[PDB]
Structure formats: structure tokens, C-alpha cells
Design a protein around this ligand. Structure first.
Ligand SMILES: Cc1cc2nc3c(=O)[nH]c(=O)nc-3n(C[C@H](O)[C@H](O)[C@H](O)COP(=O)(O)OP(=O)(O)OC[C@H]3O[C@@H](n4cnc5c(N)ncnc54)[C@H](O)[C@@H]3O)c2cc1C
Ligand SMILES: Cc1cc2nc3c(=O)[nH]c(=O)nc-3n(C[C@H](O)[C@H](O)[C@H](O)COP(=O)(O)OP(=O)(O)OC[C@H]3O[C@@H](n4cnc5c(N)ncnc54)[C@H](O)[C@@H]3O)c2cc1C
Ligand SMILES: O=c1[nH]c(=O)c2nccnc2[nH]1
Ligand SMILES: O=c1[nH]c(=O)c2nccnc2[nH]1
Lengths: 466, 466
């Protein structure tokens, strides 16, 4: 690489650039620091400038100039990923897509928009236009971009209904611009768009998204309280299996996390109580109450009876990695794991892991559709002591039937979600022959000897088969 | 010929009534004759009078008069049931709710309407009002009433998404009028409304329904063709488990049924071909094609590429018991079974039954959500020979792990769907102390020695818990 930052800058007159060191540093970091390991390994990473195109034409200008002057390019939505995805390991350009945030079309069942649209802004527009909203969104709803969700996220609120970004149909089309001497526009549909999902921006810049839309309902927050984690998980699993009770969220958070760390909801909680977090559609809420009364589920908070309370976060901001946010805000020693508990043994497996790590781990489940089954993903909190103990806890999950997607890594393959196969490798050669797009994030690109055919359970399995 | 018809008729001045023998006979029959057994057993059944109230006030005037003259009352929507549910075993009044067809409220996620609204009319109004439609409907969409669906049906198109009428949330509220000296109005919510579902009108007259609504999408008809039943069933099972691919129907119809009996679609079919009937939402259509190319599913008919669709019925009128209709319109010796193939063994079980009855049976699956899993319901065609052999075939399904809901019976308990327990018996006494509502349909009411704690698998399990 022969980086020439000065010549790059000269080629971008009319395009917004920022080179202030403090601002570049801030926009070179995400929420990697949720992992004590990443916090140490990536503490010294920073870019050289932030470039913020307003149009696809400006973006093409930027990529063309970066290819010519050999400046690395790391895409950034709003920098809320947890693994260092958007962090520029090699210096160079932080390519912000924040100003490519147009909403172009809203029709019955689908939307076309730019990558920088914030999830809640997209829903606000889809709701006003025709009472529609995203099928799923991360708990970073109000801050995260749709583009970064596709390229760096996996699922979240709404996965209970629709599965994950890993699944056919949850994305319709991705328009992607390559890093070639003449950047190419690709219109990826069918299976081809799934080369880009959760690829950390390593194989092209998403410049337009077509995604399905779902009906916007009056979603009712409710909490259900239990005296043990195992009875909370059994209730949550049963509720998730009620096919006529429409929910958007079914979470399990073990004591002592609710009472210790859900501070604004404390008056509804008590010491020793585990909680199930529920978002239930208004047309299903009476059925939800009747089911809960028949299933041992004491409703300790219900938005329909609590009144118009200000200062209460929505329950989804207590779920997914917002559960982690709340814990580490009070005690910074908390970190987390990412776990699958495979169907049909999720209740047995979550209980065994809960009992295996008393005190040191606090269980946290999110119920989701996964390959057509209802099961749960895990985001258990872990009290950090040493690097070695944290690796050991993950090793023991893997050895006890609970696949780990290691969040204490910053490469695609080590994170356990995006599998590298020959199709993934060939596509990056096509879309980034100089290796300028988010370098360092794909091990197989830097390692000719990499056994990318190893690993067991991949969340985003590769397209190659038979 | 009930002895009190003259006196009853004199009390109904101003209410529309019909005593013409031929019309009363037509309005005393449903589609029971799909069963050769019921066709013979119920041949002599007819009412004395058809009474058609326009309003709940008129209905109450009718019930109060029938109660004081002890004339039985058998409710009727539009008489499309298959079990003789709406046929008056004791003569008396056929009480048609067809003129109680108010639609009084449509909101995001729910609708309030009268019992006589035809399903497709309900959707016509919900679509015009706010682009909504029913979650599920029988394949008799264009002729069946909503109230008769609730009291006499179980699910259908849309069950792939939502389960069935057996499930919490798929009905929100039933307003019911009792048969008492002074008829009472009950507003049944929570679990209480499930006393009335599939109870054949034996424990009160539904006068208002609140049901959930779902978004009205552009549903695309597609057929997928296979050289064998097993490969068709395996594909449909896989498609049904694609959580991001939104469908409204996933049916499997084994050869020779499609080529023999799907006449207007015959130009798309070939001899020996089994078919999977699909309704896929427009926003999932591309993913459906991509999944099907990846899953060995040849799309042989697609409403978006087929050119002129004139004269083609919708694919849902080739599904559920319309599959039976198409077959028996060509050969009247076909009848059917109703089967469950319990998860997770549905592929092995359907294949085992298919191999056990060559020629005599034609397999027909409908994939549905059932207790939180994806599995299939069966409506296999059976070539009628003798009553004895039809019983044996059903016994063999039951003995091989495939529960039968016997459609060749006219009582609630023998039909295998609506379980009787103490709560059902107590409620019938509460709503119909004289037993004038559809008499003879509930064995346990006529026979206090009848053992209602038998029967293994009930589609509509009772409310009594252990
Ligand atoms: C408290 C908290 C809770 C969270 N909860 C969830 C959750 O429930 N579910 C979930 O999936 N994630 C969750 N996350 C992670 C993160 O917030 C989301 O995945 C988010 O949607 C990422 O979007 P972003 O705009 O912040 O992307 P960034 O962090 O800016 O970038 C993410 C990745 O996408 C790439 N990228 C961004 N834009 C483009 C583009 N246009 N083209 C190509 N590549 C691009 C970046 O290079 C990077 O590799 C959470 C994070 C926090 C801190
Ligand atoms: C070709 C064909 C296909 C079919 N497909 C399906 C299918 O996919 N799914 C399905 O579930 N059914 C199916 N059916 C059965 C039937 O069409 C439906 O269940 C239908 O919705 C019944 O409504 P109806 O108005 O015809 O009721 P009716 O036949 O008039 O009556 C049904 C029952 O409900 C009672 N009843 C009616 N109205 C009231 C009321 N207001 N209050 C109390 N009791 C009342 C009657 O006494 C009777 O017991 C099919 C039938 C045919 C002929
Ligand atoms: O950066 C993240 N990417 C993800 O896919 C994710 N998924 C769940 C929770 N946090 C997450 N964080
Ligand atoms: O009269 C019917 N009642 C039902 O519940 C039903 N379910 C499926 C198919 N036909 C059916 N016919």
C-alpha cells in the first residue's frame, strides 16, 4: 500500500471531510469496549479522516480516489456495533454513511431506503405513511443504522416472529458499490445479497436497501415475575409457542439483574425475582393475560394499567445487549457471551449453564425463531476476572452443547457468525481486489493456510453446498 | 313435525320466517354428504321452520318464544359445514343468522362484526378501510360465515402463520345470547370464549365477534411440481420452516389428484406430478424463488409469469376441503379423513400412511403451526368401498401414530375435535338448561353414563386443568 492522504483529499472537493483528531478518534470507535479483551487490543486504533458522502455519486468519487491513492476504507453507520467492526485497523478513511439516509419508497410490505437511515426514523416514517414498521431491529433502535444492522448485526426485537438477518426474506435487495478502479454497482437479490449480510463491510458498500415491512401495532410492554430463573424460562418458552398471541419480544433476565440494574422499573420489582420481558400486540393482550393466568405467570408491570409514566425506558431497552448496557453502567466489570441453545433442549441446556456458573454468570435469554423452531439465544452476563477464565467459560459452553459466538474477537471468522467459504473469499477478490475495504477483519484474506472449513456452528452459514 | 309449531309461529309476527317444505329442507342440510356415512344416516333430517332475525333484539324475541314452546333451535350461518353440524336432528327451528351481518369497527389489528358476515365480505371491508384482512379463513372463503367458522370450523388458509381457532388470540371476544326463559347476553373474553369455539352452537348464539386482523398483502399463487409425494412433502416442510418467507398457504396434494382433478390448471400440470400449493407475499416472492432453486423445487405455475389468468380459480380453492370438492365433482366415490401427523415425525408418518394405502388413498397435507411447531394436518382422499373398511383405515392411522378427527360422525365428541369435560357440561346447562340448542350434537348431555374422559388426542382440548 502507498497511502497518499494529501492527494486523496485534493480529489474530494465538495465532499464533506473531517480531519480533526478528536472527532476522527471518536468516529473510529464503536462499543468494542463492552469486551475487556477488545478494549485492550483496540485501544490505540484511529483513522486519519472521516468522509461523509451525501449521494451514491459522491461515494463513488470517494472509492475511486481511495483505490487510486491506496487509502484503506472502513464503513461506519453510527458506530454502535460491539465487536470493533467499524474500527479502522489500518488507519485511512472512516467512510460514514450517516448522510446517505434517504427514504425513497414505502409500499404495502416493503421499503427502499439508504444505509444511514436510523431504525427508529425508518419506523417513524413507515408508521406515518401507512402504519408499517420494520420486522426486526436491534435494541439500539433509536441510534443504529439499517445499513450497519445488515452489515454488522444479526437480529433483535422481532426475531421472535421473523428469525434473523441470517434468513431468506428478511432482506429483499442490497445495492452494493465495489472497491474497484471503476467502482461497480451491484444489484444483489435472491441468495447473492447474503454474501454481504454480517460481512462487516468487507465486500462492498451498501448504498440502497430494500427490506420487507410488517404491520405497526400498539405494542404493549409487560413484565412477568418469577422466583427462579428456570420457571421464568419455562414460561417464556411456553408463551413464545402460542401461535395466536402476537408478540415482538420475549426475553428472560435472571435475578439479580432486574432488581440490581433495572433501576427505573424498580418499584415493580423485588429482590430475588427473575423477569420475562414481553411486548404483546394490543389485539393479543387479553389472550396474553388469560394465558399467563393459566401458566403461573404473575404480571408485575403492564403498560395498559401503569398510566402515562414519563422517564420509564421501553422494555426493549432492557433487552438484548441493552441488558448488558444496564449491568456495566452500574458495575463495569460485567461483560457478556453470545450463545445458542439448540432446539429442542433449550430449557435443559440453559438450566445446566445457569447452575454451572453461579454468581459469576447471570443468565439472559432471548426467544427467537431459528430454522423454523422456537428456541432462545443467550446473552449471559459474565463477571470479568481474567482473560483465561473468560475463555474457559466459553470453552465449557461449547463442550456442554451450547455453541458460542465469541464476542471477544474482532474478525469475522473468530466471531463465529459469518462463515468464510470459497464463495465468500472469491467475492471479496471481486469487490475488493486491493484489500482496501475494512482490512484485518477477514482472517482468510490474510491467511492463505486458513482452514475456513473448520468451526462447528455458524450463525450465517456460507452459500456453498454439495 | 314438532307439536308446537302453530303456537310458535303466531308469536313471531314481524320476524321473517319460512315454512315452505322444499326451502326448509335445503336450509336444513349442509355439506354432510361429503361423508357417505352421513349422507345415509342424515337423509331424513329436516326442520319445521327457518327463522331469520335481523337484529339481536329480534333474535332474543325468537329464542324467548322457542324456549316457552320448547321448540329446538339449530343455528345456521350459510350451511357449508361438512359434519351436519347445522342440521336439526330434532326438527324444529333452523335459526339463520345470515341477516346479522353488521361490521361495526375496524382498527389496527382487530375487527368487530356480526355472525352472518361472509368471510370474503369481511376482508373486502377490512381491505378498503385500512389494508387489513382475516388471519385465517376456510377455503369456503366466498360462501362461509364468520360465526359459522367459529362455531363449526377449525382453521384453513393462514394457519401456516397463525395456528387455528383452537389457539389463544385467534379470537378476541364472543358475544353470546343464551337459551333461557329470559335470554341473557354474555360477553366472553380471555379463556371463557373458548367454551364456544367449535361447540356447534350448543351453548349459545354468537351475535358479535371480535377477531384479530392481519395485513393485506399482494398474495402470489404458485405451484411447485414434484415426481413423488415424499419429495413434495419434504419441500413444503422446508418452505414452511423459512421464517422470513411469508406465506399464507402451504399445501401438498399427491398425484394423481392434481392432474386428474385440477382441471383449469391442467395446462401447468403433467401426469404423475404431485404439487405444493403456495401463497407467498409479494415482498417474499423473490426469496421464495431463490429458496426453491436451492431446494430442488421446480416452480411449475406462478401467477406473475403465467400470462392470462382468466378462468383460473385461486389456488386456495384447490386446497383444504376444496381439494375434496374437486375430486368428488369428478368421481363421487371419493371421501376424506382428517388427520394430525405429530411433530417432529410428520415426514415419516405421512410417507408411511401413503405407502400403506396405495390406490385407495391420495395423500393431501396442509402445513400449519401447531402448539408452536410447524407440522401438517391431513385431508387425504379415500376411495369409499364399505363403512367397515373406512373405519379400518382410520383405526390404522390412529394405531400408527396419526390421530384421526373422524369426519364421518355428527356429534361433537365422536368428531374428535371438541372435547367434553365438566366445564363444557356446566356451561351448556348455564346457556341451555332445557337442551333446546342443537340437540343430539353433544353425547355427554344426553347420556350421563357416557365416559367423556376417554378419547386420546383432542384438537380443541377442554379448559379443565389438572
Ligand atoms: C446496547 C447495545 C445493544 C445492541 N443490541 C443489538 C441487538 O439487539 N441486535 C443486533 O444485531 N445488534 C445489537 N447491537 C449492535 C449494534 O448496535 C447493531 O448491530 C447496529 O444495528 C449496528 O449498526 P451501526 O449503524 O451502529 O453500524 P456500525 O457499528 O457503524 O457498523 C457495523 C458494521 O457494518 C459496516 N457497515 C456500516 N454501514 C455499512 C454500509 N453502508 N455498507 C457496508 N458496510 C457497512 C461497518 O463497517 C461495520 O463492519 C447492540 C449494541 C449496543 C451497544
Ligand atoms: C369445499 C369446502 C371446504 C371447506 N374448507 C374448510 C376449511 O379450510 N376450514 C374449515 O374450518 N372448514 C372448512 N369447511 C367447513 C365450512 O365451510 C367452514 O367451517 C365454515 O366456516 C362454516 O361456516 P358456515 O356459515 O357454513 O356454518 P354452518 O355450516 O351454517 O354452521 C356451522 C356450525 O356453527 C353453528 N353456528 C352457525 N352460526 C352460529 C352462530 N351465530 N352462533 C352459534 N352457532 C352457530 C351451526 O349450528 C353449526 O353447528 C369447508 C367446507 C366445504 C364444503
Ligand atoms: O455488534 C453486534 N452484532 C450483533 O450481530 C449482535 N447480535 C446480538 C447482540 N449484540 C450484537 N452486537
Ligand atoms: O365442517 C368442517 N369443520 C372443520 O373444522 C373443518 N376443518 C378442516 C376441513 N374441513 C372442515 N369442515
Amino acid at each position: 500500500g502507498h497511502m497518499n492522504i494529501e492527494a486523496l483529499t485534493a480529489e474530494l472537493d465538495g465532499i464533506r471531510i473531517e480531519d480533526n483528531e478528536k472527532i476522527v478518534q471518536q468516529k473510529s470507535r464503536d462499543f468494542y469496549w463492552y469486551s475487556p479483551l477488545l478494549k485492550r487490543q483496540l485501544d490505540h486504533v484511529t483513522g486519519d479522516l472521516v468522509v461523509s458522502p451525501k449521494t451514491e455519486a459522491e461515494l463513488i468519487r470517494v472509492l475511486k480516489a481511495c483505490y487510486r491513492h491506496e487509502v484503506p476504507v472502513t464503513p461506519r453507520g453510527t458506530g454502535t456495533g460491539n465487536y470493533g467492526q467499524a474500527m479502522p485497523l489500518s488507519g485511512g478513511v472512516v467512510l460514514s454513511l450517516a448522510d446517505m439516509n434517504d427514504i425513497r419508497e414505502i409500499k404495502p410490505g416493503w421499503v427502499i431506503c439508504g444505509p444511514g437511515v436510523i431504525c427508529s426514523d425508518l419506523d417513524k416514517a413507515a408508521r406515518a405513511h401507512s402504519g408499517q414498521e420494520l420486522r426486526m431491529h436491534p435494541s439500539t433502535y433509536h441510534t443504529a443504522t439499517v445499513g450497519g444492522f445488515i452489515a454488522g448485526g444479526s437480529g433483535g426485537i422481532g426475531s421472535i416472529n421473523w428469525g434473523g438477518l441470517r434468513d431468506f426474506g428478511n432482506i429483499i435487495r442490497l445495492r452494493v458499490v465495489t472497491m474497484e478502479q471503476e467502482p461497480q454497482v451491484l444489484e444483489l437479490t435472491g441468495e447473492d445479497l447474503h454474501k454481504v449480510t454480517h460481512a462487516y463491510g468487507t465486500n462492498g458498500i451498501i448504498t440502497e436497501i430494500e427490506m420487507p415491512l410488517a404491520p405497526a401495532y400498539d405494542w404493549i410492554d409487560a413484565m412477568v415475575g418469577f422466583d427462579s430463573f428456570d420457571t421464568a424460562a419455562a414460561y417464556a418458552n411456553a408463551l413464545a409457542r402460542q401461535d395466536g398471541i402476537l408478540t415482538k419480544l420475549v426475553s428472560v433476565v435472571a435475578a439479580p439483574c432486574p432488581f440490581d440494574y433495572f433501576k427505573r422499573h424498580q418499584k415493580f420489582l423485588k429482590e430475588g425475582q427473575s423477569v420475562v420481558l414481553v411486548m404483546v400486540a394490543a389485539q393479543s393482550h387479553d389472550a396474553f393475560k388469560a394465558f399467563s393466568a393459566r401458566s403461573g405467570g404473575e404480571i408485575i408491570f403492564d403498560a395498559t394499567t401503569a398510566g402515562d409514566l414519563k422517564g420509564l425506558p421501553p422494555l426493549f431497552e432492557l433487552s438484548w445487549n441493552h441488558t448488558t448496557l444496564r449491568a456495566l453502567r452500574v458495575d463495569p466489570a460485567w461483560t457478556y457471551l453470545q450463545v445458542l441453545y439448540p432446539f429442542p433442549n433449550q430449557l435443559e441446556l440453559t438450566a445446566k449453564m445457569d447452575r454451572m456458573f453461579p454468581g459469576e454468570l447471570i443468565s439472559h435469554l432471548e426467544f427467537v425463531r431459528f430454522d423454523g423452531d422456537i428456541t432462545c439465544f443467550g446473552l449471559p452476563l459474565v463477571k470479568f476476572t481474567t482473560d483465561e477464565r473468560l475463555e474457559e467459560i466459553m470453552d465449557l459452553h461449547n463442550a456442554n452443547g451450547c455453541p458460542i459466538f465469541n464476542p471477544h474477537r474482532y474478525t469475522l471468522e473468530e466471531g463465529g457468525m459469518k462463515q468464510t467459504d470459497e464463495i465468500q473469499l472469491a467475492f471479496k477478490r471481486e469487490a475488493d481486489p486491493k484489500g482496501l475495504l475494512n482490512p484485518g477483519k477477514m482472517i482468510a484474506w490474510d491467511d492463505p493456510d486458513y482452514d475456513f472449513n473448520s468451526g462447528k456452528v455458524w450463525l450465517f452459514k456460507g452459500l456453498k453446498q454439495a
